[PDB]
């Protein structure tokens, strides 16, 4: 504590969080970026926004935050506030309506070698195209593009920590199953600025919907109405209740439309399979 | 020694972010404005709100932050927090939720020659009076009005940005490769205009703003499949009542009044979607 107090006072006596933490301005700050998916909160088909709970692990070296443990009682690692130090400004480029950057400023683990590890939490509300063609049997490949907003690849380089996101602490989802996940790095250089590449890391998740809820709540009543539709042709005309049966099946389907709109998403990107079945049943009646 | 630190101390040791970068009070600061739209999230008919994801391209000159790359080891760009530099304070005047400023205060890029670039991203919820007459086969004219919350036209003025070809970007910029069209709305046009008013002697100090008019077209597929076609068929069913016999077992009044009941159910359904 006294050793760490003295060390922190020495470190932040003339520290600057404005400039990049490099010995020479011609050096590059390498940032190892690792995304951990903790939870898949929601998939919004109407607004095309996937909400996730993530830990965005970031690792980089700070040249000025170095010390010898022998001069400070053997202190080899410490925790300091992240707001006091320079950090990369990773931004979710496909942010729909959430936060673009990190807002929860947790503490960084600082090694005596200058190595920083910062693992803040974030709620990523990301915008991805939601193909509803095969709904509720639909598969959705949704990506999260991450990159340094104000720094280019020539001054700050970013690399993935691993080829795949960390799903070790992922909570089981009751609506989606993550079939595949992969983190790809991309570099784009423009002819106007040939010496300043712009880098990003895009994590994509291929997810398959679990359709039992919609099968039980939507498909089975529609099947029952479809079966009941043809029974009027076995009902004799002398009963005087043919129109009663047919029009009341129509009334039941019309009331069930309220449940249909309540349950399924409402979007005009395409006609869902469940919507096609609803329209088929209605034309049938 | 990092040369970035030396440049930062040279520029910012004697610098006031509260003062405009003008040598005289009556000089005007010119702001080059570009607005890039990333995603059109939603248009809430009930609240009459348009939610969009944008980032604003802001460029201007600051003679106080002017440096030569030769003197400072060849540095052509410097990233500093936006709170340390003067800003024109561009706000969305027609926001409906009370959020005027940008979502993330990104760093400003200070280039050599006094050129300052700021590219902050923003989420805006703007007023859009929904023209309900032809709903759902309707198009809207949502506006995004940008202005300086502090400075008048004589103090700060706006100009449109120019691309590498040199033409003026008098519209909303959209990156085609990165743009995913909204599921319900298609953006057709997006002109931009710089307006000036209150500039008369009787009016007093002049005022200016930039207005972007998003012309958006609704895709009526959901309403066509789910509401209009079933309602049309059910409303056509009453014509079948003319062919049923006028006897006890005809069920003529059965078919007619139950079609009315289904129409009432559709009224309840439609009341949840239409504007108020």
């Amino acid at each position, epitope marked *: 504590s006294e050793h760490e107090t003295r060390l922190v006072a020495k470190l932040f006596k003339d520290y600057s969080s404005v400039v990049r933490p*490099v*010995e*020479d301005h*011609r*050096q*590059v*700050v*390498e940032v*190892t970026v690792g995304l951990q998916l903790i939870q898949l909160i929601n998939v919004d088909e109407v607004n095309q926004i996937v909400t996730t709970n993530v830990r965005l692990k970031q690792q980089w*070296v700070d*040249y000025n935050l170095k010390w010898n443990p022998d001069d400070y009682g053997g202190v080899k690692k410490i925790h300091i506030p992240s707001e006091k130090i320079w950090r990369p400004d990773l931004v979710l480029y496909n942010n729909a309506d959430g936060d673009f950057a990190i807002v929860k400023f947790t503490k960084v683990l600082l*090694q005596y*070698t*200058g*190595h920083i590890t910062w693992t803040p939490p974030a709620i990523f509300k990301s915008y991805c195209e939601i193909i509803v063609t095969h709904f509720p049997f639909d598969e959705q490949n949704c990506s999260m593009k991450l990159g340094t907003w104000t720094y280019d*690849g*020539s*001054v700050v*380089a970013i*690399n993935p920590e691993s080829d795949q996101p960390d799903l070790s602490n992922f909570m089981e989802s009751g609506e989606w199953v993550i079939k595949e996940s992969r983190g790809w790095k991309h*570099s784009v250089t423009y002819s106007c600025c040939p*010496d300043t590449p712009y880098l990003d890391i895009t994590y994509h998740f291929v997810m398959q919907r679990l359709p039992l809820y919609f099968i039980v709540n939507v498909i089975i009543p529609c099947l029952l109405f479809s079966f009941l539709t043809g029974l009027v042709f076995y009902l004799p005309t002398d009963s005087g209740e043919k129109m009663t049966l047919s029009i009341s099946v129509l009334l039941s389907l019309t009331v069930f439309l309220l449940v249909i709109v309540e349950l399924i998403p409402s979007t005009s990107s395409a006609v869902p399979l469940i919507g096609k079945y609803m329209l088929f049943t209605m034309v049938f009646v | 020694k990092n040369e970035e630190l030396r440049l930062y101390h040279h520029l910012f040791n004697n610098y006031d972010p509260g003062s405009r970068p003008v040598r005289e009070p009556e000089d005007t600061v010119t702001i080059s404005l570009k607005v890039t739209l990333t995603n059109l999230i939603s248009l809430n008919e009930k609240e009459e709100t348009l939610t969009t994801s944008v980032w604003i391209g802001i460029d201007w000159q600051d003679y106080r932050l002017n440096y030569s*790359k*030769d003197d400072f*080891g*060849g540095i*052509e760009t410097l990233r500093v927090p936006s709170e340390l530099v003067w800003l024109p304070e561009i706000v969305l005047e027609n926001n409906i939720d009370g959020q005027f400023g940008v979502a993330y205060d990104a760093n400003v890029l200070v280039y050599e020659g006094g050129s300052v670039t700021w590219l902050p991203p923003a989420i805006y919820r703007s007023v859009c009076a929904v023209e309900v007459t032809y709903f759902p086969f309707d198009w809207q004219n949502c506006s995004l009005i940008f202005r300086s919350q502090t400075y008048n036209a004589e103090e700060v003025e706006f100009t449109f940005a120019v691309d590498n070809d040199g033409k003026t970007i008098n519209k909303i910029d959209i990156d085609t490769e990165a743009y995913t069209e909204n599921g319900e709305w298609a953006i057709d046009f997006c002109p931009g205009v710089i307006r000036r008013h209150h500039g008369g002697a009787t009016d007093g100090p002049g005022e200016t703003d930039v207005i972007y008019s998003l012309i958006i077209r609704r895709k009526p597929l959901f309403y066509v499949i789910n509401i209009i076609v079933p309602c049309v068929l059910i409303s056509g069913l009453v014509l079948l009542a003319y062919f049923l016999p006028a006897q006890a077992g005809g069920q003529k009044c059965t078919v007619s009044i139950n079609v009315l009941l289904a129409q009432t159910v559709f009224l309840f359904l439609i009341a949840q979607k239409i504007p108020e």
Partner: antibody
Amino acid sequence: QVQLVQSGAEMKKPGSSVKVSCKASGGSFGSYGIDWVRQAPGQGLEWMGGIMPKFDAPKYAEKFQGRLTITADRATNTAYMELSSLRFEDTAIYYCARDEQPFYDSWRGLYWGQGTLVTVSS
Amino acid sequence: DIVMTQSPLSLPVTPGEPASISCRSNQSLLHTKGYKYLNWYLQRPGQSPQVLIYFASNRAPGVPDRFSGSGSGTDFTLKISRVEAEDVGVYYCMQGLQIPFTFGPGTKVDIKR
């Protein structure tokens, strides 16, 4: 103090492959800032290859293309080289030169390994 | 490849008086941003090489203040304020601009007697 420790000396024959490591301690190193330099007996230094952020991939000399593979592991703070199809003239002391923070389009080599003698002889 | 040469091939020195080494390239090493990519390396007898000056003017961390460097687009110089007994070895100049990077033939140094 930052120290680079290379693998041990190796005795090889023509046509075989030698893999030399370069392990770092006392500091943190990344995916870039690695260069391998050999010194034959009674001859000067010669650059073999390395990794720079400009290319994001290793670049080798014309002599070593197809035979040399250079890699750097950020997680374990070590780098490797793998030279295949060894010849008699490849006998030399092989060094690793590294920088904690790499330069974009060049290299400096502030920290050097102790050098490993690879002797190719039948 | 860019050809790099140094002079003198062998320089006797006495401790307590300055010294100078020179290196020359067959192409201008000037970068577009305005700095010259030329590094100097010292290999003491039996030890690994040590960087002395990088980019032709910058003293590396941990290097004594004696070693200084300067140069132009094609000609570069390395100077020692006052030679010490520990400064004996082979000095190499290296360009870091164009792949393949090339070291010089190397300049030898020894105590004069």
